[PDB]
């Protein structure tokens, strides 16, 4: 996260670290959406151009964390993956269209003060909150500049008008993406950056006081550049796929 601040303790209890077994390293962020399902970006698991194709046994998820590097005894829980599910129409060749994946844990994680699932939006929550100018929040342990944080970082960023997202880039933007970030005029800054991908873009509903995951950190060209914006997977648009996988393969 660039130009963020340290997260508070328990601030993002759905935040998950995707952790490579060997060598031991952070791959990406992710989010807890039930006791056995974790949401992340497809490209964190599958990106052929860079020879990335993780299997279940390559990976761990670390839930309940605040510190990046420390083993947080009595606080974090580390879970093994039972099964990975990549959206069948994830477009790794062109533009990361449908950059979404689900990971089923071998065992349920126990909820605590530090471990708690985020809501997924309904059509109405999405219709209501996914509006230009409305701010969401992005968290992660990714790079601080286009070094690395001691603890989980947080930044709040406004959703940007779709023509502005499109005109900021040569990449073809689809309806399964939205962008967020301040404009050069606006005088505030901030962005996700490398290592933050797969983490959540959340919004707090003013209607029921609940946090909803509206986006997944997907891509940007650099980090915190003027005239550029971060791109997020549009979670509600892909929610049918999410339910389909969970209904079918959940217990």
């Amino acid at each position: 996260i660039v130009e963020g601040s340290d997260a508070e303790i328990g601030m993002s209890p759905w935040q998950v670290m995707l952790f490579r077994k060997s060598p031991q390293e952070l791959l990406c962020g992710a989010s807890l959406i039930s006791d056995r399902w974790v949401l992340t970006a497809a490209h964190c698991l599958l990106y052929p151009p860079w020879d990335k194709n993780f299997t279940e046994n390559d990976l761990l998820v670390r839930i309940g964390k605040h510190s990046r590097t420390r083993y947080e005894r009595n606080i974090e829980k580390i879970s093994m993956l039972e099964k990975i599910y990549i959206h069948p129409r994830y477009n790794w060749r062109e533009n990361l269209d449908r950059d979404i994946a689900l990971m089923k844990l071998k065992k349920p994680v126990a909820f605590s003060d530090y471990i708690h699932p985020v809501c997924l939006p309904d059509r109405e929550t999405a219709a209501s909150l996914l509006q230009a100018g409305y701010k969401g929040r992005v968290t992660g342990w990714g790079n601080l500049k286009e070094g690395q944080p001691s603890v989980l970082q947080v930044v709040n960023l406004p959703i940007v008008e779709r023509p502005v997202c499109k005109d900021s880039t040569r990449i073809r933007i689809t309806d399964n993406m939205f962008c967020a970030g301040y404009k050069p005029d606006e005088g505030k800054r901030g962005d996700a950056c490398e290592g933050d991908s797969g983490g959540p873009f959340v919004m707090k509903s003013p209607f029921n006081n609940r946090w909803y995951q509206m986006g997944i950190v997907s891509w940007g060209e650099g980090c915190d550049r003027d005239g550029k914006y971060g791109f997020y997977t549009h979670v509600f648009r892909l929610k049918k796929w999410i339910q389909k996988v969970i209904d079918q393969f959940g217990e």
């Binding site: 601030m11 699932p117 809501c119 406004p158 707090k204 006081n209 946090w211």
Partner: peptide
């Protein structure tokens, strides 16, 4: 979804606010 989703034990459950959530509310005009 889940019944208790998106309600944080150290914030919403205890009725404590984090330091910048109000920035989000103030944007929902």
């Amino acid at each position: 979804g889940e019944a208790d989703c998106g309600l944080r034990p150290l914030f919403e459950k205890k009725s404590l606010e984090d330091k910048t959530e109000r920035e989000l509310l103030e944007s929902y005009i």
